[PDB]
Amino acid sequence: AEVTPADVAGDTALSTISDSAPADEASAPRWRAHVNAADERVKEMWAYSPSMDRNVPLVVITADESAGPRPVIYLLNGGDGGEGAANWVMQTDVLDFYLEKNVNVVIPMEGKFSYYTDWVEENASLGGKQMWETFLVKELPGPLEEKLNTDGQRAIAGMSMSATTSLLFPQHFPGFYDAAASFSGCAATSSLLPWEYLKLTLDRGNATPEQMWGPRGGEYNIYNDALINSDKLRGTELYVSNASGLAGEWETGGIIEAATNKCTHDLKAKLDSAGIPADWNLRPTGTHSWGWWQDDLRGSWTTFARAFELE
C-alpha cells in the first residue's frame, strides 16, 4: 500500500507489543494450546491499547525470511471475537494454510460482539471502553508491522459480524489496505433490516446498537454503513462472499436467509453500477459451517495473491 501506518495514525498514542501475556492473567485462553502445538512461526503476542486501556491478545502467523519482508493480513473473528470456541484458530486450519503461503497474519483474540469499531458508549459487559477501530487502524499497525518486518503491503479480512468491519475500514482510510475480504456479512447497517442484524449480534454481548453507533440513521451510523459509502472502496482489491452465513451469529431460516441475502444483492448491484470490481463467492451451499469459512480463506487467496503480487 502507498499509505503508511504513520499516515493514518496521526498523533494517536501507539500500542506497545509484548511477547508474553499480562502477569494479571487469571487462566490460560482456550486457544493457547493450539498456538503452542503449531509451527514456531506461529506466535502469541499481546498489544496494549492506550485508548481502551486494554491488553489485547493476538495470534500471529509470521512469514519466513526466505523472500524478505512479506505482506500482513489482519484477519478478524466474527462475534465470538476469539473469546469463546467459535473462531478461526479453534475451528479451522488457518495456521497451516497461511504458514504455507509465507505471509504474516494477525488475528486479534478479543473483541467479542464489538463489530471491531469505536463505540459511542462504554459497556461493562464488553470490558468498558471499546475503540477497536482506533486500535486496529491507528494504534497497532505501526509497532506491529515494524516487529514483523512487513513489506508495507496489508489487507483486512473479516467474517460474519466483522465482514462489515472489513468493508468499513478501507472506506474510512482509503489506500491503507491493498485488499479487503468480506466473508458473509452485511455492508448496510443503517436501514431497518441491517440495523436488526446489529441488534441480534449485540444482544449476545448484552449491548445495543445505539451504544455502538448512536441513533439509527444518525451521522455516525451512516459513516459506518458500508453500503451507503461503497464508492469509497474504489482502488481496493475486493473479495466478497454471500451473506447467508451471517445468521450463524444468532445460532424462517428461510426468511432469515432471504433477508440477509439482500445485503449481498444490494452491495454487488451498487459496486457494479460504480464500476468497482470484486472477486465473488456466490454459489449457495448446504452449510455455512466452519468448512465454508475455511473455504473463504482459499477463495480470498486469489484476491490477496493478486493485490500483493505474490508468486
C-alpha positions as CSV (number, residue, x, y, z in Angstrom):
1,A,0.0,0.0,0.0
2,E,1.2,3.6,-0.6
3,V,-0.3,4.7,2.7
4,T,1.8,4.1,5.8
5,P,0.9,3.4,9.4
6,A,2.0,6.8,10.4
7,D,-0.1,8.4,7.7
8,V,-3.3,7.0,9.2
9,A,-2.3,7.1,12.9
10,G,-1.9,10.9,13.2
11,D,-1.0,11.7,16.8
12,T,-2.7,8.6,18.3
13,A,-0.8,7.1,21.2
14,L,0.7,3.9,19.8
15,S,0.4,0.3,21.0
16,T,3.2,-1.5,22.9
17,I,3.6,-5.1,21.8
18,S,4.6,-7.7,24.3
19,D,5.8,-11.3,23.7
20,S,4.2,-12.5,26.9
21,A,0.7,-12.4,28.5
22,P,-0.1,-10.0,31.3
23,A,1.0,-11.1,34.8
24,D,-2.6,-10.2,35.6
25,E,-3.8,-13.3,33.6
26,A,-6.3,-15.4,35.6
27,S,-6.4,-18.5,33.4
28,A,-5.0,-19.7,30.0
29,P,-7.1,-18.8,27.0
30,R,-8.6,-21.8,25.2
31,W,-6.6,-21.1,22.0
32,R,-3.2,-21.2,23.7
33,A,-2.8,-25.0,23.3
34,H,-3.4,-24.6,19.5
35,V,-0.7,-22.0,19.2
36,N,1.8,-24.0,21.4
37,A,1.4,-27.1,19.2
38,A,1.9,-25.2,15.9
39,D,5.0,-24.3,14.0
40,E,7.4,-21.9,15.7
41,R,6.4,-19.2,13.3
42,V,3.0,-19.0,15.0
43,K,3.3,-16.7,18.0
44,E,1.2,-15.4,20.8
45,M,1.7,-11.6,21.2
46,W,-0.1,-9.0,23.3
47,A,-0.8,-5.4,22.3
48,Y,-1.6,-2.7,24.8
49,S,-4.3,-0.3,23.6
50,P,-3.9,3.1,25.2
51,S,-7.4,4.2,24.1
52,M,-9.1,1.2,25.7
53,D,-6.5,0.7,28.5
54,R,-6.7,-3.0,27.5
55,N,-4.2,-5.7,26.7
56,V,-5.4,-7.3,23.5
57,P,-4.1,-10.9,22.7
58,L,-3.0,-11.6,19.1
59,V,-2.4,-14.9,17.4
60,V,0.2,-14.1,14.8
61,I,1.4,-16.3,11.9
62,T,4.8,-15.0,10.9
63,A,6.3,-15.3,7.4
64,D,9.6,-16.9,6.9
65,E,12.7,-14.9,5.8
66,S,13.2,-16.8,2.5
67,A,11.9,-13.9,0.5
68,G,12.5,-11.0,2.8
69,P,9.6,-8.7,4.0
70,R,6.1,-10.1,3.4
71,P,2.5,-8.6,3.5
72,V,0.3,-8.8,6.6
73,I,-3.3,-9.8,6.6
74,Y,-5.4,-8.6,9.6
75,L,-7.9,-11.4,10.0
76,L,-10.9,-10.8,12.2
77,N,-13.1,-13.3,14.0
78,G,-16.8,-13.0,14.0
79,G,-19.0,-12.2,17.0
80,D,-17.1,-14.7,19.1
81,G,-14.2,-12.3,19.0
82,G,-11.7,-15.1,19.7
83,E,-13.1,-15.1,23.2
84,G,-15.0,-18.4,23.0
85,A,-14.8,-21.5,20.9
86,A,-16.2,-20.3,17.6
87,N,-13.2,-18.7,16.0
88,W,-10.6,-19.2,13.2
89,V,-7.9,-20.7,15.4
90,M,-10.1,-23.2,17.2
91,Q,-12.3,-24.3,14.3
92,T,-10.2,-24.1,11.1
93,D,-6.8,-24.9,9.6
94,V,-6.0,-21.2,9.4
95,L,-2.5,-21.6,10.9
96,D,-1.4,-24.3,8.5
97,F,-2.9,-22.7,5.4
98,Y,-1.2,-19.3,5.9
99,L,2.1,-20.7,7.2
100,E,2.4,-22.4,3.8
101,K,1.6,-19.1,1.9
102,N,4.5,-17.3,3.6
103,V,2.6,-14.2,4.7
104,N,2.1,-12.5,8.0
105,V,-1.4,-12.9,9.6
106,V,-2.6,-11.1,12.7
107,I,-5.7,-12.5,14.4
108,P,-6.9,-10.5,17.5
109,M,-8.5,-12.8,20.1
110,E,-10.6,-10.3,21.9
111,G,-13.4,-8.1,20.7
112,K,-16.5,-10.2,21.1
113,F,-19.7,-8.6,19.8
114,S,-17.9,-5.4,19.1
115,Y,-18.1,-5.0,15.3
116,Y,-14.4,-4.0,15.8
117,T,-15.5,-0.4,15.8
118,D,-15.2,2.7,18.0
119,W,-18.2,2.7,20.3
120,V,-20.1,5.9,21.3
121,E,-20.8,4.5,24.8
122,E,-18.9,2.3,27.3
123,N,-20.4,-1.2,28.1
124,A,-19.1,-3.0,31.1
125,S,-20.2,-6.4,29.7
126,L,-17.8,-5.9,26.9
127,G,-15.0,-4.6,29.0
128,G,-15.8,-0.9,29.1
129,K,-14.4,1.4,26.5
130,Q,-14.3,0.0,23.1
131,M,-12.1,1.7,20.5
132,W,-11.3,-1.2,18.1
133,E,-11.1,0.9,15.0
134,T,-8.6,3.2,16.7
135,F,-6.7,0.2,17.9
136,L,-6.6,-1.9,14.7
137,V,-6.0,1.0,12.3
138,K,-4.1,3.6,14.4
139,E,-2.5,2.1,17.5
140,L,-1.4,-1.4,16.3
141,P,0.0,-1.4,12.7
142,G,3.0,0.9,13.2
143,P,4.7,-1.1,16.1
144,L,3.4,-4.4,14.9
145,E,4.4,-4.2,11.3
146,E,7.8,-3.0,12.4
147,K,8.2,-6.0,14.7
148,L,7.1,-8.4,11.9
149,N,9.3,-6.7,9.3
150,T,6.5,-6.5,6.8
151,D,6.9,-5.3,3.2
152,G,4.5,-2.5,3.7
153,Q,1.5,-4.3,2.0
154,R,-1.6,-5.1,4.0
155,A,-5.1,-6.5,3.8
156,I,-8.1,-6.6,6.1
157,A,-10.5,-9.6,6.3
158,G,-13.5,-10.4,8.5
159,M,-16.3,-12.9,8.7
160,S,-20.0,-12.6,9.7
161,M,-20.0,-9.6,12.2
162,S,-16.5,-8.4,11.1
163,A,-17.4,-8.8,7.4
164,T,-18.9,-5.4,8.0
165,T,-15.7,-4.1,9.6
166,S,-13.6,-5.3,6.6
167,L,-15.6,-3.1,4.2
168,L,-15.7,-0.1,6.6
169,F,-12.0,0.1,7.4
170,P,-10.9,0.7,3.7
171,Q,-13.7,3.2,3.2
172,H,-12.6,5.1,6.3
173,F,-8.9,5.0,5.3
174,P,-8.7,4.7,1.5
175,G,-5.4,3.3,0.3
176,F,-4.2,2.0,3.7
177,Y,-5.4,-1.6,2.7
178,D,-4.3,-3.2,-0.6
179,A,-7.2,-5.7,-0.3
180,A,-10.3,-6.3,1.8
181,A,-12.2,-9.6,2.2
182,S,-15.8,-9.6,3.5
183,F,-16.8,-13.2,4.3
184,S,-20.7,-13.4,4.6
185,G,-21.5,-10.1,6.2
186,C,-23.9,-7.2,5.7
187,A,-22.4,-4.0,4.3
188,A,-25.5,-2.0,5.1
189,T,-26.0,-1.1,8.7
190,S,-28.5,1.8,8.9
191,S,-31.6,0.6,7.2
192,L,-34.2,-1.4,9.1
193,L,-33.2,-5.0,8.5
194,P,-29.4,-4.4,8.6
195,W,-29.9,-2.5,11.9
196,E,-31.8,-5.5,13.2
197,Y,-28.8,-7.6,12.4
198,L,-26.7,-5.3,14.6
199,K,-29.3,-5.8,17.4
200,L,-29.2,-9.5,17.2
201,T,-25.4,-9.7,17.2
202,L,-25.0,-7.2,20.0
203,D,-27.7,-8.8,22.2
204,R,-25.3,-11.7,22.7
205,G,-22.9,-9.3,24.3
206,N,-25.5,-7.6,26.4
207,A,-25.3,-4.5,24.2
208,T,-27.4,-2.4,21.9
209,P,-26.5,-0.7,18.6
210,E,-27.3,2.8,19.9
211,Q,-24.4,2.2,22.4
212,M,-22.1,1.4,19.5
213,W,-23.0,3.8,16.6
214,G,-25.6,6.2,18.1
215,P,-29.2,6.6,16.8
216,R,-30.2,4.6,13.8
217,G,-29.8,6.8,10.7
218,G,-27.7,9.3,12.6
219,E,-24.5,10.7,11.2
220,Y,-22.1,8.2,12.9
221,N,-24.3,5.2,11.9
222,I,-24.2,6.4,8.2
223,Y,-20.4,6.8,8.4
224,N,-20.5,3.1,9.5
225,D,-22.8,2.0,6.7
226,A,-20.6,0.3,4.1
227,L,-23.4,0.1,1.5
228,I,-24.1,3.8,1.5
229,N,-20.3,4.5,1.3
230,S,-19.5,1.7,-1.1
231,D,-17.9,4.0,-3.7
232,K,-15.1,4.7,-1.3
233,L,-13.9,1.1,-1.8
234,R,-12.6,2.1,-5.3
235,G,-8.9,1.1,-5.6
236,T,-9.1,-1.7,-3.1
237,E,-8.9,-5.3,-4.3
238,L,-12.1,-7.0,-3.0
239,Y,-13.3,-10.4,-2.2
240,V,-17.0,-10.8,-1.1
241,S,-18.9,-14.0,-0.2
242,N,-22.7,-14.2,0.1
243,A,-24.2,-13.0,3.4
244,S,-26.3,-16.1,4.3
245,G,-23.6,-17.3,6.8
246,L,-24.2,-14.1,8.9
247,A,-27.2,-15.8,10.6
248,G,-24.7,-18.1,12.3
249,E,-24.1,-15.3,14.8
250,W,-27.6,-15.7,16.3
251,E,-27.3,-19.5,16.3
252,T,-37.9,-18.8,8.9
253,G,-34.3,-19.7,8.4
254,G,-36.0,-19.3,5.0
255,I,-36.9,-15.7,5.8
256,I,-33.6,-15.2,7.6
257,E,-31.6,-16.4,4.6
258,A,-33.7,-14.3,2.2
259,A,-33.3,-11.2,4.3
260,T,-29.5,-11.5,4.8
261,N,-29.1,-12.4,1.1
262,K,-30.4,-8.9,0.2
263,C,-27.2,-7.5,1.8
264,T,-25.1,-9.1,-0.8
265,H,-27.5,-8.3,-3.6
266,D,-27.5,-4.6,-2.8
267,L,-23.7,-4.4,-2.5
268,K,-23.0,-6.1,-5.8
269,A,-25.6,-4.0,-7.6
270,K,-24.0,-0.9,-6.1
271,L,-20.4,-1.8,-6.8
272,D,-21.3,-3.0,-10.3
273,S,-23.0,0.3,-11.0
274,A,-19.9,2.2,-9.9
275,G,-17.5,0.1,-11.9
276,I,-15.8,-1.3,-8.8
277,P,-14.8,-4.9,-9.3
278,A,-14.7,-7.7,-6.7
279,D,-14.0,-11.4,-6.6
280,W,-17.3,-13.0,-5.8
281,N,-18.2,-16.2,-3.9
282,L,-21.9,-16.6,-4.6
283,R,-22.7,-20.3,-5.2
284,P,-25.1,-21.5,-2.4
285,T,-24.0,-24.5,-0.4
286,G,-25.8,-26.8,2.0
287,T,-23.9,-25.4,5.0
288,H,-22.2,-22.3,6.3
289,S,-20.2,-24.3,8.8
290,W,-16.5,-23.9,9.6
291,G,-15.9,-25.7,6.3
292,W,-17.5,-22.8,4.5
293,W,-15.5,-20.2,6.4
294,Q,-12.3,-22.1,5.8
295,D,-13.1,-22.3,2.1
296,D,-13.3,-18.4,2.1
297,L,-9.6,-18.4,3.2
298,R,-8.9,-20.3,-0.1
299,G,-11.2,-18.2,-2.2
300,S,-9.8,-14.9,-0.9
301,W,-6.3,-16.0,-1.6
302,T,-7.0,-15.2,-5.3
303,T,-7.6,-11.6,-4.2
304,F,-4.7,-11.4,-1.8
305,A,-2.1,-13.0,-4.2
306,R,-3.2,-10.5,-6.9
307,A,-3.1,-7.5,-4.6
308,F,0.2,-8.4,-3.1
309,E,1.8,-9.6,-6.3
310,L,2.8,-12.9,-4.8
311,E,4.0,-15.8,-7.0
